[PDB]
Amino acid sequence: TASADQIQECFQIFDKDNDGKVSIEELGSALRSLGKNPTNAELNTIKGQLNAKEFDLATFKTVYRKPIKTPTEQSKEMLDAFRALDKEGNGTIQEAELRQLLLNLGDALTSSEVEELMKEVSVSGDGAINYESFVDMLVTGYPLA
Template sequence: MAEASSEPTEQQIAEYRKHFNNYDFRHVGAVLSDDLGNLLRACGQVPTEGWIKERLKVADPEGKGSIEWDGFIKIIKQASVQGNPEDELLEAFRRFDKGLTGMIRASDLRHIMTSLGDVLTEDEVDELIRDADPMSVGSVNYESLVRTLIYGPN
């Protein structure tokens, strides 16, 4: 991957700063470590809890419970290197959509989320499937699921 793709544009940095400031509830130039996942999602990322924990070891090595802007921008740059999460997720799900219906079986969703990329725990997958297939019909509209994962619920 080209080095240039890992550097956010000035416009992206301004957007990240806006989101960072929105999560800086105490107005001290830092966000709570517990808010990192939500902050990254607000910035268009789709981090897993494991990925977040690994980044917190670097951004908050003393365990202060907060992350300053410099630490956050390093994390967002790492996340940006990974590419467009929406496209990557859609492509992963399409591989299981043999009929190109926009739907995949809940069992395939479980397989994807527990074995490919940053894996989720069984509890996380159970919750995801309950949310994605509330009527327990056994299939999930993955395009809607991806939008929810990236941009949050309606």
């Protein structure tokens, strides 16, 4: 979990103009940068509670230290989700279906986000991806410095 020094460092990186404030539109990005993964719903509740267009470091610390799920806390739910989508029982999903779900349903990702995700994903000659490897990439990839 991010130390106080790591939280400050992160905040300062987001606070490009050094005025001690970061736009509320970047709160999700900043939390995510330090290994906590709010859903859109959760983030919206947090933003609504802040009732502000920007936040300071003290606030960021307070918000971040709450029990927002880390990536390992999401493994079970992700694997359950992918298993429910697994037609063949072989641990794969078609990358085309994955792209569609990410982009068109739920808390839809942007095209740019989806291309960055898929750049690191091995696709077979029948267009299949191993979803546990994908989950593993999401959970273990780019850990805290």
